[PDB]
């Protein structure tokens, strides 16, 4: 195969204050597997510096509850039903940046990739 | 394949026997390691002393003076499965007539499964000194006669019946 | 005037030739798999192109504001459904609606060439009588699907489950480690309880617990998986693998069911659709036929070469050098060494250079182009100029494919050859008159190729780690469309169900059963069609005093039946000659001294035969020679057995020959003996025909030997079983040097040599031994070279060709001379209803009468009560036609049933059941209060009183099984009187009454074919039990299915029968040579030796078997087919 087809689209903002939610929905032929299903959230406002992580699946949900945005990601998300879009809340001027979806969904081997611009519209 | 037969019931003074004791594999192509503990008793003694036990390669036997240095091992060779359990007695004499038991102990692999099985064969068996011929062969051979003497008679009795019947036809003209 | 411009555009040539070739180019454009970002514009060109043309069409069939103007004709509709989901796909984020119109415009070429719509009405009208044969069809499959959902109700889903060393029973069933994989299966082992059953290995036990066999679909749980596996059977579609499965989890005593429905479903209901078909197209075919200085150099030259001589070695010599050609190219074989492939090469020089000589030598006498006029010129001047060609290159790459083009000049034998010429004939004639029809076949297995891509392409790529381990493309996928087309290709060779599944598990059970199913149709009934169409487009003092009652002895029919019934007692005395003979030692010594008895009384029947009838009167009858072969067998065999000659080579091989004791059964049965004589009259045309059928796959043959020749030797990791890759191993230097882990294994069955390629050739063509054959080739890349997976992928096209020519107008020519040989012989017999006695002659036209009959309306009135009112309610079809609704909701209610159901619901069935029996009997009760005097006008009201009896008694025994001594499998069997009180559907089944009494009528013809061929099965069963009742545990002989004892090798050659696993069944013996096998295995209880069978014998015996067999369905599909002929027409 060549990857994993995620649907997300190209660019979603929210109006400021309201909650927001982050989408990343994938569909893959595979029955998804709650033991071996890894997926990763990633937010970057650099061009080519180190990227750090701070959501993950692995066997459960983990939020690291990283301590530069907030404590904001929550999971609002279903892995049976392919979506896995995420909760966010208190949406401030300082949330803009590029959110990047890793997935990987035993037994495919292509990590699926959805790239997002966090953004804030009138 | 392999198919599982029943030993000889006598045997014969002074000459040659071969006991066997196949406990084939329940599935041909489990692998087995298999072993087995022969034993007897003595006919008229309520005991079972084991006589000998038989491993990998190597056959061991024990100090019983009934068995020491006149048996020798006829099962599989070089297999590690053994599937075919065969004593063969060289110079069977009146010391060993009796029940003899076959305890084969295999042990079946399998992916992440070792069964451990164990199957008992028993076998009687009685020397004697004179080879009586089995009854099934007795009562075969004499049969087999009687069929072929009753079936010419009755065949030259249609043959000089149709001839008389022939003669009192022919000598009408 | 204003559509006056747009009517000469439609009907001008050059617009109908613009559709033509931008419906060809879109086609050309769809088999691209992934096309590049370029080729939107390109279908934009397309749609805009079919807008044009519908924009013309609009302007042309529409004057002064019409709105609907091409809407009366069929495929008008289509192209404006194209165009129209053509320009909704418009909007992107309407999506699934690309896999809409994509495969929807597929179908717009079936508008080609106009021409190509008479064939396809055609072939719609031909289908349009099959609904009673269709009818029928489902009626039998839903039945037997019941028998089956009944007898086999979870019985798939059994597998060996080990004994819990230890959620509980919850987590243990569904864990799928605690079962038995077959080392290398991917799927548990089926096991079974009883007896003659699947053994479950030592530490397991037998539960009904588990997934299901093959992805899920190959089960009798439910009635639509029922249908589903008995469709499988019907087509004989792989089904011996549901054979064993089912045999392995209920038991080797169900395999009755399979011999019905083989029988009855899968050779029948066949019969009937072939019959029927052939009707239809006799039918069109019919009502078709009734509507319808240099001069002088010149000329002394041409005086030198034309005046020679004509007959005496001009045209005998070529033809002669022909045959040594073909025998040189013949001769070529791997390994070859020098100072022999030196002499084929320069005897390919010497014959090249000689066919120049001559087409110079006809040439410069014939003056082109005059010489290219008869046709055969031609085809020798193209041949010549290929050989010209292929030996001034001697190094083309990777084309040298061309070097086998050679081989066509053996079709130059076609001059003198009538047979080979009428097989050029039909096949020309196919691209010919029949080029519309070929052209639709090609059309349909195109779209049916792309749709199958556009459908299912994207899945066979993501959802592809489903249905392959490695998460990699299958071997047949439909990601693109070389593959789809081989996929549909074999799907009309027979092979659609194993490539269904991966479909339901892929891309949608529904979408993928709907697909397979429309071309397992519409593709089989086009193959069909152009088959039926190539194949009608091709037309004494005491001596003689003793003497007489000796004669009269030996006719007497108390001898007569008395020998017969020895011959039958002795014939099954060599069955119980198991590998169980040792241990049962007392049934062998009756059975030694029954062996002299035997033989002592054949010895005394031949001497009483002889001095009856005189030497010359008895040596000039086969059958008495027959006799006398096996009397003087069994002789020798006792002579060397008394003398002590027993444990000898020659003398042991000999006793192999007590299995043709059953011979002697031809000469006393007379059925038996009409059937051989009807296989021996016509067997002169068919060696003939046999003849140039070998010419045709020795071309084949030669063809494919050139292209491999040894390239199927590869490295075998000796560890585990599988191929290396060329990442590991790429050469055979490579395949000696890893060294005890390297075998450099071949195929067995490969194209090595001539032999060895008529062999692979055979497998091909039956269809069951292809598989193995065409992986090694495909993945062949050169002589001594380690294969890479689908390296020559497109050596897949070879194979598809000999399937086309050695397969299917082979197969023409034969049923055509098999035909025409048929027709002469039953014209010269008188004469009609060949294969049956006097007696069953009799039977057959007092039967017939029988069925000709009609009801004497023998049902005046009753006598004088409220029972006139009764019998006045009872006989009005208003009635007639409730009772058959009340069993059609019988049926239903039974469908309903599956395995695992609720207590609840399984007391539901009951009580709905219990009512259907009340009913019936309330009807039953009412018919003999109308007709009390007899009741017993038409067999049918027997019938219904018989079943409705049986129904009665089955419930009692059902209540007294679960009341008492209880045991499923009898009750499964016991509560099987439900398929008689549907059975009762006949009464009113019209069109299926007369299927089945031309069944009940051909039933003679039949049973004496089966007869023979039972014999053939005895004879064979022994062979057998003699050879191969030793040989290992390969694929196709199992722990089940083997010739160990009578049952196994009954059991595998009924699956031979229908040509099913006999390439499995051939892999073990082919085994000659360690490390493949071990000659001196010793295994107890047998003193035999040696787990490998002799590849020769094993040859021999299954091809013979397949040719016999082949012979013998033949013989028996045509007896069917006149039988319904005679019927109907
Ligand atoms: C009828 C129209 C046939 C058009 C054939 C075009 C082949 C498509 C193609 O190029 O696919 C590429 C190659 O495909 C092939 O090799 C085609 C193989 C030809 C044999 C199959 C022909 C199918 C229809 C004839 C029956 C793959 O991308
Ligand atoms: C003509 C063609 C008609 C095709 C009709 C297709 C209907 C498909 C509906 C369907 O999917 O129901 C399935 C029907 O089961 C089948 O296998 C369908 C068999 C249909 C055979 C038709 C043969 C004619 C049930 O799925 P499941 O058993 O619950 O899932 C098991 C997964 N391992
Ligand atoms: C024509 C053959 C019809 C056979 C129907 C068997 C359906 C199996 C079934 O109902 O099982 C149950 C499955 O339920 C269904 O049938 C829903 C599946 C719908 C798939 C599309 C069905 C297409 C129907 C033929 C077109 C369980
Ligand atoms: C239409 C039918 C066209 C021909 C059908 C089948 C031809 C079978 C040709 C078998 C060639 C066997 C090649 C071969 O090497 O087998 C060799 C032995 O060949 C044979 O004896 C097989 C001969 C087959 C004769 C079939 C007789 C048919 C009788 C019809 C009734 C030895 O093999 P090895 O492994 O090297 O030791
Ligand atoms: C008339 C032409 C076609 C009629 C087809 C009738 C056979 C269809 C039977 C469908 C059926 O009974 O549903 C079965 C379940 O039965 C039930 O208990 C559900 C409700 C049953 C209602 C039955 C309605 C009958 C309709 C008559 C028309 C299928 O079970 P499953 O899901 O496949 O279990 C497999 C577990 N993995
Ligand atoms: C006689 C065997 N043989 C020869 C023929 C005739 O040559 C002109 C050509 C080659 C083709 O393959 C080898 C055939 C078909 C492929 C199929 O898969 C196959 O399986 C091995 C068996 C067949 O059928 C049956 C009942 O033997 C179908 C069946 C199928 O496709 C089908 C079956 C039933 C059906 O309607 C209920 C619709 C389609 C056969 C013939 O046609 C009846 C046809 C089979
Ligand atoms: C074939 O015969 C064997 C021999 O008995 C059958 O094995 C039996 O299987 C049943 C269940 O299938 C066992 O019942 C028990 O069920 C409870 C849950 O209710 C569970 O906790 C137990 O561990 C066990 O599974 C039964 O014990 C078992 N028999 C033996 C002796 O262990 C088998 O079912 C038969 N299969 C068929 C298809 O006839
Ligand atoms: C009307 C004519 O009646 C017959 C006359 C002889 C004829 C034409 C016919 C049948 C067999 C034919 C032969 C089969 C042989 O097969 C071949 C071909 C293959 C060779 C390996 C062996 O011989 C032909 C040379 C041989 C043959 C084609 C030559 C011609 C023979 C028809
Ligand atoms: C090392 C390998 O040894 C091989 C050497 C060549 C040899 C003997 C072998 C196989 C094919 C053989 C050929 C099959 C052909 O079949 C025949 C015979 C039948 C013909 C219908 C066709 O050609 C032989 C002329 C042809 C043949 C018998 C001639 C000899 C060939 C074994
Ligand atoms: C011992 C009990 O275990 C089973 C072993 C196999 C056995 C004997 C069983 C019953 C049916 C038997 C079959 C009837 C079939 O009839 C035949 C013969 C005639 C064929 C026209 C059709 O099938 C056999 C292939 C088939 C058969 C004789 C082969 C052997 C089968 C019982
Ligand atoms: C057979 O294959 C081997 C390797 O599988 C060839 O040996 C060398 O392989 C390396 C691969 O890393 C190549 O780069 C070399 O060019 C190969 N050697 C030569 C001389 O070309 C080997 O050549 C192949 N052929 C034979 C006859 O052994
Ligand atoms: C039994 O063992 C003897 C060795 O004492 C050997 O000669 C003989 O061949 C063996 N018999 C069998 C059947 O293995
Ligand atoms: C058996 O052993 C006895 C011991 O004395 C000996 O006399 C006899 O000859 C032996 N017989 C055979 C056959 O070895
Ligand atoms: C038989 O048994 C007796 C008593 O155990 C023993 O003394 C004798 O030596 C045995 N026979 C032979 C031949 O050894
Ligand atoms: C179990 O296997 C061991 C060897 O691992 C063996 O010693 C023991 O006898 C076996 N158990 C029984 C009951 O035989
Ligand atoms: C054969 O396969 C096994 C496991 O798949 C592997 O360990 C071994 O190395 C292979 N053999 C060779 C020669 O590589």
């Given at each position: 195969?060549?990857?994993?087809?995620?649907?997300?689209?190209?660019?979603?903002?929210?109006?400021?204050?309201?909650?927001?939610?982050?989408?990343?929905?994938?569909?893959?032929?595979?029955?998804?597997?709650?033991?071996?299903?890894?997926?990763?959230?990633?937010?970057?406002?650099?061009?080519?510096?180190?990227?750090?992580?701070?959501?993950?699946?692995?066997?459960?949900?983990?939020?690291?509850?990283?301590?530069?945005?907030?404590?904001?990601?929550?999971?609002?998300?279903?892995?049976?039903?392919?979506?896995?879009?995420?909760?966010?809340?208190?949406?401030?001027?300082?949330?803009?940046?590029?959110?990047?979806?890793?997935?990987?969904?035993?037994?495919?081997?292509?990590?699926?990739?959805?790239?997002?611009?966090?953004?804030?519209?009138? | 394949?392999?198919?599982?037969?029943?030993?000889?019931?006598?045997?014969?003074?002074?000459?040659?026997?071969?006991?066997?004791?196949?406990?084939?594999?329940?599935?041909?192509?489990?692998?087995?390691?298999?072993?087995?503990?022969?034993?007897?008793?003595?006919?008229?003694?309520?005991?079972?002393?084991?006589?000998?036990?038989?491993?990998?390669?190597?056959?061991?036997?024990?100090?019983?003076?009934?068995?020491?240095?006149?048996?020798?091992?006829?099962?599989?060779?070089?297999?590690?499965?053994?599937?075919?359990?065969?004593?063969?007695?060289?110079?069977?004499?009146?010391?060993?007539?009796?029940?003899?038991?076959?305890?084969?102990?295999?042990?079946?692999?399998?992916?992440?499964?070792?069964?451990?099985?164990?199957?008992?064969?028993?076998?009687?068996?009685?020397?004697?000194?004179?080879?009586?011929?089995?009854?099934?062969?007795?009562?075969?051979?004499?049969?087999?006669?009687?069929?072929?003497?009753?079936?010419?008679?009755?065949?030259?009795?249609?043959?000089?019946?149709?001839?008389?019947?022939?003669?009192?036809?022919?000598?009408?003209? | 005037?204003?559509?006056?411009?747009?009517?000469?555009?439609?009907?001008?040539?050059?617009?109908?030739?613009?559709?033509?070739?931008?419906?060809?180019?879109?086609?050309?454009?769809?088999?691209?798999?992934?096309?590049?970002?370029?080729?939107?514009?390109?279908?934009?060109?397309?749609?805009?192109?079919?807008?044009?043309?519908?924009?013309?069409?609009?302007?042309?069939?529409?004057?002064?504001?019409?709105?609907?103007?091409?809407?009366?004709?069929?495929?008008?509709?289509?192209?404006?459904?194209?165009?129209?989901?053509?320009?909704?796909?418009?909007?992107?984020?309407?999506?699934?609606?690309?896999?809409?119109?994509?495969?929807?415009?597929?179908?717009?070429?079936?508008?080609?060439?106009?021409?190509?719509?008479?064939?396809?009405?055609?072939?719609?009208?031909?289908?349009?009588?099959?609904?009673?044969?269709?009818?029928?069809?489902?009626?039998?499959?839903?039945?037997?699907?019941?028998?089956?959902?009944?007898?086999?109700?979870?019985?798939?889903?059994?597998?060996?489950?080990?004994?819990?060393?230890?959620?509980?029973?919850?987590?243990?069933?569904?864990?799928?480690?605690?079962?038995?994989?077959?080392?290398?299966?991917?799927?548990?082992?089926?096991?079974?309880?009883?007896?003659?059953?699947?053994?479950?290995?030592?530490?397991?036990?037998?539960?009904?617990?588990?997934?299901?066999?093959?992805?899920?679909?190959?089960?009798?749980?439910?009635?639509?998986?029922?249908?589903?596996?008995?469709?499988?059977?019907?087509?004989?579609?792989?089904?011996?693998?549901?054979?064993?499965?089912?045999?392995?989890?209920?038991?080797?005593?169900?395999?009755?069911?399979?011999?019905?429905?083989?029988?009855?479903?899968?050779?029948?209901?066949?019969?009937?659709?072939?019959?029927?078909?052939?009707?239809?197209?006799?039918?069109?075919?019919?009502?078709?036929?009734?509507?319808?200085?240099?001069?002088?150099?010149?000329?002394?030259?041409?005086?030198?070469?034309?005046?020679?001589?004509?007959?005496?070695?001009?045209?005998?010599?070529?033809?002669?050098?022909?045959?040594?050609?073909?025998?040189?190219?013949?001769?070529?074989?791997?390994?070859?060494?020098?100072?022999?492939?030196?002499?084929?090469?320069?005897?390919?020089?010497?014959?090249?250079?000689?066919?120049?000589?001559?087409?110079?030598?006809?040439?410069?006498?014939?003056?082109?182009?005059?010489?290219?006029?008869?046709?055969?010129?031609?085809?020798?001047?193209?041949?010549?100029?290929?050989?010209?060609?292929?030996?001034?290159?001697?190094?083309?790459?990777?084309?040298?494919?061309?070097?086998?083009?050679?081989?066509?000049?053996?079709?130059?034998?076609?001059?003198?050859?009538?047979?080979?010429?009428?097989?050029?004939?039909?096949?020309?004639?196919?691209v010919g008159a029949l080029g519309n029809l070929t052209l639709v076949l090609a059309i349909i297995v195109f779209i049916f190729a792309v749709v199958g891509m556009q459908l299912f392409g994207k899945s066979y790529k993501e959802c592809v780690c489903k249905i392959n381990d490695d998460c990699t493309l299958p071997r047949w996928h439909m990601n693109d469309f070389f593959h789809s087309f081989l996929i549909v290709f074999r799907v009309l060779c027979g092979e659609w169900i194993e490539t269904m599944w991966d479909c339901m598990e892929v891309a949608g059970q529904t979408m993928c059963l709907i697909v397979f199913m429309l071309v397992m149709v519409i593709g089989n009934l086009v193959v069909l069609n152009l088959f039926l169409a190539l194949l009608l487009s091709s037309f004494g003092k005491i001596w003689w005093n003793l003497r007489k009652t000796c004669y009269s002895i030996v006719e007497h029919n108390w001898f007569e039946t008395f020998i017969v019934f020895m011959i039958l007692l002795s014939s099954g005395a060599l069955a119980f000659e198991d590998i169980y003979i040792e241990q049962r030692k007392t049934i062998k010594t009756m059975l030694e001294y029954?062996?002299?008895?035997?033989?002592?009384?054949?010895?005394?029947?031949?001497?009483?035969?002889?001095?009856?009838?005189?030497?010359?009167?008895?040596?000039?009858?086969?059958?008495?020679?027959?006799?006398?072969?096996?009397?003087?067998?069994?002789?020798?065999?006792?002579?060397?057995?008394?003398?002590?000659?027993?444990?000898?080579?020659?003398?042991?091989?000999?006793?192999?020959?007590?299995?043709?004791?059953?011979?002697?059964?031809?000469?006393?049965?007379?059925?038996?003996?009409?059937?051989?004589?009807?296989?021996?009259?016509?067997?002169?045309?068919?060696?003939?025909?046999?003849?140039?059928?070998?010419?045709?796959?020795?071309?084949?043959?030669?063809?494919?030997?050139?292209?491999?020749?040894?390239?199927?030797?590869?490295?075998?990791?000796?560890?585990?079983?599988?191929?290396?890759?060329?990442?590991?191993?790429?050469?055979?230097?490579?395949?000696?040097?890893?060294?005890?882990?390297?075998?450099?294994?071949?195929?067995?069955?490969?194209?090595?040599?001539?032999?060895?390629?008529?062999?692979?050739?055979?497998?091909?063509?039956?269809?069951?031994?292809?598989?193995?054959?065409?992986?090694?080739?495909?993945?062949?890349?050169?002589?001594?070279?380690?294969?890479?997976?689908?390296?020559?992928?497109?050596?897949?096209?070879?194979?598809?060709?000999?399937?086309?020519?050695?397969?299917?107008?082979?197969?023409?020519?034969?049923?055509?001379?098999?035909?025409?040989?048929?027709?002469?012989?039953?014209?010269?017999?008188?004469?009609?209803?060949?294969?049956?006695?006097?007696?069953?002659?009799?039977?057959?036209?007092?039967?017939?009468?029988?069925?000709?009959?009609?009801?004497?309306?023998?049902?005046?009135?009753?006598?004088?009560?409220?029972?006139?009112?009764?019998?006045?309610?009872?006989?009005?079809?208003?009635?007639?036609?409730?009772?058959?609704?009340?069993?059609?909701?019988?049926?239903?209610?039974?469908?309903?049933?599956?395995?695992?159901?609720?207590?609840?619901?399984?007391?539901?069935?009951?009580?709905?059941?219990?009512?259907?029996?009340?009913?019936?009997?309330?009807?039953?009760?009412?018919?003999?209060?109308?007709?009390?005097?007899?009741?017993?006008?038409?067999?049918?009201?027997?019938?219904?009183?018989?079943?409705?009896?049986?129904?009665?008694?089955?419930?009692?025994?059902?209540?007294?099984?679960?009341?008492?001594?209880?045991?499923?499998?009898?009750?499964?069997?016991?509560?099987?009187?439900?398929?008689?009180?549907?059975?009762?559907?006949?009464?009113?089944?019209?069109?299926?009454?007369?299927?089945?009494?031309?069944?009940?009528?051909?039933?003679?013809?039949?049973?004496?074919?089966?007869?023979?061929?039972?014999?053939?099965?005895?004879?064979?069963?022994?062979?057998?039990?003699?050879?191969?009742?030793?040989?290992?545990?390969?694929?196709?002989?199992?722990?089940?299915?083997?010739?160990?004892?009578?049952?196994?090798?009954?059991?595998?050659?009924?699956?031979?029968?229908?040509?099913?696993?006999?390439?499995?069944?051939?892999?073990?013996?082919?085994?000659?040579?360690?490390?493949?096998?071990?000659?001196?295995?010793?295994?107890?209880?047998?003193?035999?030796?040696?787990?490998?069978?002799?590849?020769?014998?094993?040859?021999?015996?299954?091809?013979?078997?397949?040719?016999?067999?082949?012979?013998?369905?033949?013989?028996?599909?045509?007896?069917?087919?006149?039988?319904?002929?005679?019927?109907?027409?």
């Amino acid at each position: 195969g060549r990857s994993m087809e995620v649907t997300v689209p190209a660019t979603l903002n929210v109006l400021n204050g309201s909650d927001a939610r982050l989408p990343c929905t994938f569909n893959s032929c595979y029955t998804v597997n709650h033991k071996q299903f890894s997926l990763n959230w990633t937010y970057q406002e650099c061009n080519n510096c180190s990227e750090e992580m701070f959501l993950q699946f692995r066997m459960k949900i983990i939020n690291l509850k990283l301590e530069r945005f907030q404590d904001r990601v929550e999971f609002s998300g279903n892995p049976s039903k392919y979506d896995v879009s995420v909760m966010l809340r208190n949406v401030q001027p300082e949330d803009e940046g590029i959110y990047n979806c890793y997935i990987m969904n035993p037994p495919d081997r292509h990590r699926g990739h959805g790239k997002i611009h966090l953004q804030v519209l009138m | 394949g392999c198919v599982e037969v029943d030993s000889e019931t006598e045997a014969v003074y002074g000459m040659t026997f071969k006991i066997l004791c196949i406990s084939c594999k329940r599935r041909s192509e489990t692998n087995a390691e298999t072993f087995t503990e022969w034993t007897f008793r003595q006919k008229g003694t309520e005991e079972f002393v084991k006589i000998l036990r038989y491993e990998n390669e190597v056959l061991q036997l024990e100090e019983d003076e009934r068995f020491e240095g006149r048996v020798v091992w006829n099962g599989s060779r070089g297999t590690k499965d053994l599937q075919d359990l065969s004593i063969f007695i060289t110079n069977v004499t009146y010391n060993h007539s009796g029940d003899y038991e076959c305890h084969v102990y295999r042990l079946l692999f399998f992916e992440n499964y070792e069964h451990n099985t164990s199957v008992v064969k028993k076998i009687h068996i009685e020397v004697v000194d004179k080879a009586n011929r089995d009854m099934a062969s007795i009562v075969s051979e004499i049969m087999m006669y009687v069929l072929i003497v009753v079936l010419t008679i009755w065949l030259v009795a249609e043959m000089i019946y149709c001839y008389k019947k022939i003669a009192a036809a022919t000598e009408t003209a | 005037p204003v559509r006056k411009i747009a009517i000469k555009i439609l009907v001008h040539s050059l617009f109908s030739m613009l559709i033509m070739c931008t419906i060809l180019t879109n086609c050309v454009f769809m088999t691209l798999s992934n096309p590049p970002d370029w080729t939107k514009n390109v279908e934009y060109t397309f749609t805009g192109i079919y807008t044009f043309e519908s924009l013309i069409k609009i302007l042309a069939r529409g004057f002064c504001l019409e709105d609907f103007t091409f809407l009366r004709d069929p495929w008008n509709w289509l192209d404006f459904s194209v165009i129209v989901m053509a320009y909704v796909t418009e909007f992107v984020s309407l999506v699934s609606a690309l896999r809409t119109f994509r495969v929807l415009r597929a179908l717009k070429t079936i508008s080609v060439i106009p021409g190509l719509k008479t064939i396809v009405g055609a072939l719609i009208q031909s289908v349009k009588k099959l609904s009673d044969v269709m009818i029928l069809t489902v009626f039998c499959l839903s039945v037997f699907a019941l028998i089956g959902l009944q007898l086999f109700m979870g019985n798939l889903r059994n597998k060996c489950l080990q004994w819990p060393p230890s959620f509980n029973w919850k987590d243990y069933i569904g864990d799928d480690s605690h079962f038995y994989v077959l080392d290398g299966q991917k799927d548990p082992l089926l096991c079974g309880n009883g007896s003659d059953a699947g053994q479950c290995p030592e530490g397991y036990i037998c539960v009904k617990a588990g997934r299901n066999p093959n992805y899920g679909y190959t089960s009798f749980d439910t009635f639509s998986w029922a249908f589903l596996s008995l469709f499988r059977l019907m087509t004989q579609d792989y089904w011996e693998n549901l054979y064993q499965l089912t045999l392995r989890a209920a038991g080797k005593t169900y395999m009755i069911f399979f011999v019905l429905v083989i029988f009855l479903g899968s050779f029948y209901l066949v019969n009937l659709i072939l019959a029927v078909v052939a009707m239809a197209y006799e039918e069109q075919n019919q009502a078709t036929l009734e509507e319808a200085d240099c001069c002088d150099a010149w000329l002394k030259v041409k005086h030198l070469v034309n005046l020679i001589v004509m007959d005496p070695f001009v045209d005998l010599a070529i033809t002669i050098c022909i045959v040594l050609n073909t025998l040189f190219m013949a001769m070529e074989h791997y390994p070859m060494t020098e100072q022999f492939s030196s002499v084929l090469t320069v005897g390919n020089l010497v014959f090249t250079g000689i066919f120049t000589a001559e087409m110079v030598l006809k040439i410069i006498a014939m003056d082109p182009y005059y010489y290219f006029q008869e046709g055969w010129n031609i085809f020798d001047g193209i041949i010549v100029s290929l050989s010209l060609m292929e030996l001034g290159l001697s190094n083309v790459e990777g084309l040298s494919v061309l070097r086998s083009f050679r081989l066509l000049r053996v079709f130059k034998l076609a001059k003198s050859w009538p047979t080979l010429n009428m097989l050029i004939k039909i096949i020309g004639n196919s691209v010919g008159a029949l080029g519309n029809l070929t052209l639709v076949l090609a059309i349909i297995v195109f779209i049916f190729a792309v749709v199958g891509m556009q459908l299912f392409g994207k899945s066979y790529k993501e959802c592809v780690c489903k249905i392959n381990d490695d998460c990699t493309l299958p071997r047949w996928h439909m990601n693109d469309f070389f593959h789809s087309f081989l996929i549909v290709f074999r799907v009309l060779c027979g092979e659609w169900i194993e490539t269904m599944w991966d479909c339901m598990e892929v891309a949608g059970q529904t979408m993928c059963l709907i697909v397979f199913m429309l071309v397992m149709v519409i593709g089989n009934l086009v193959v069909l069609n152009l088959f039926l169409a190539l194949l009608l487009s091709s037309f004494g003092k005491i001596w003689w005093n003793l003497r007489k009652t000796c004669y009269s002895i030996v006719e007497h029919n108390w001898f007569e039946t008395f020998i017969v019934f020895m011959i039958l007692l002795s014939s099954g005395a060599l069955a119980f000659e198991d590998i169980y003979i040792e241990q049962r030692k007392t049934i062998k010594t009756m059975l030694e001294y029954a062996d002299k008895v035997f033989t002592y009384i054949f010895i005394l029947e031949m001497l009483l035969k002889w001095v009856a009838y005189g030497f010359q009167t008895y040596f000039t009858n086969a059958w008495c020679w027959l006799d006398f072969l096996i009397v003087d067998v069994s002789l020798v065999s006792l002579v060397a057995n008394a003398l002590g000659y027993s444990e000898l080579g020659a003398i042991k091989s000999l006793r192999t020959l007590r299995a043709l004791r059953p011979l002697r059964a031809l000469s006393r049965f007379e059925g038996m003996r009409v059937v051989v004589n009807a296989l021996v009259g016509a067997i002169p045309s068919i060696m003939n025909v046999l003849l140039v059928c070998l010419i045709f796959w020795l071309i084949f043959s030669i063809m494919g030997v050139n292209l491999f020749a040894g390239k199927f030797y590869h490295c075998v990791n000796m560890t585990t079983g599988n191929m290396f890759d060329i990442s590991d191993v790429n050469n055979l230097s490579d395949c000696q040097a890893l060294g005890k882990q390297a075998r450099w294994k071949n195929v067995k069955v490969n194209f090595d040599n001539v032999g060895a390629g008529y062999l692979a050739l055979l497998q091909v063509a039956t269809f069951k031994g292809w598989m193995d054959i065409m992986y090694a080739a495909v993945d062949s890349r050169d002589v001594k070279l380690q294969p890479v997976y689908e390296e020559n992928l497109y050596m897949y096209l070879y194979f598809v060709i000999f399937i086309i020519f050695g397969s299917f107008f082979t197969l023409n020519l034969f049923i055509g001379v098999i035909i025409d040989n048929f027709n002469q012989q039953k014209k010269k017999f008188g004469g009609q209803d060949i294969f049956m006695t006097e007696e069953q002659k009799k039977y057959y036209n007092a039967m017939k009468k029988l069925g000709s009959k009609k009801p004497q309306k023998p049902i005046p009135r009753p006598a004088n009560k409220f029972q006139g009112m009764v019998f006045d309610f009872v006989t009005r079809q208003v009635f007639d036609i409730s009772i058959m609704i009340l069993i059609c909701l019988n049926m239903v209610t039974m469908m309903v049933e599956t395995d695992d159901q609720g207590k609840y619901m399984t007391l539901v069935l009951s009580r709905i059941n219990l009512v259907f029996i009340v009913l019936f009997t309330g009807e039953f009760v009412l018919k003999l209060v109308s007709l009390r005097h007899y009741y017993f006008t038409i067999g049918w009201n027997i019938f219904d009183f018989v079943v409705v009896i049986l129904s009665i008694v089955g419930m009692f025994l059902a209540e007294m099984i679960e009341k008492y001594f209880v045991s499923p499998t009898l009750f499964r069997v016991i509560r099987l009187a439900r398929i008689g009180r549907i059975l009762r559907l006949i009464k009113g089944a019209k069109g299926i009454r007369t299927l089945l009494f031309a069944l009940m009528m051909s039933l003679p013809a039949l049973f004496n074919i089966g007869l023979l061929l039972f014999l053939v099965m005895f004879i064979y069963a022994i062979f057998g039990m003699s050879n191969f009742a030793y040989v290992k545990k390969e694929a196709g002989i199992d722990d089940m299915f083997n010739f160990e004892t009578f049952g196994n090798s009954m059991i595998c050659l009924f699956q031979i029968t229908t040509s099913a696993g006999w390439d499995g069944l051939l892999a073990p013996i082919l085994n000659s040579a360690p490390p493949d096998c071990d000659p001196d295995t010793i295994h107890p209880g047998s003193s035999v030796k040696g787990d490998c069978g002799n590849p020769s014998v094993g040859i021999f015996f299954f091809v013979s078997y397949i040719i016999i067999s082949f012979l013998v369905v033949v013989n028996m599909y045509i007896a069917v087919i006149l039988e319904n002929f005679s019927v109907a027409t």
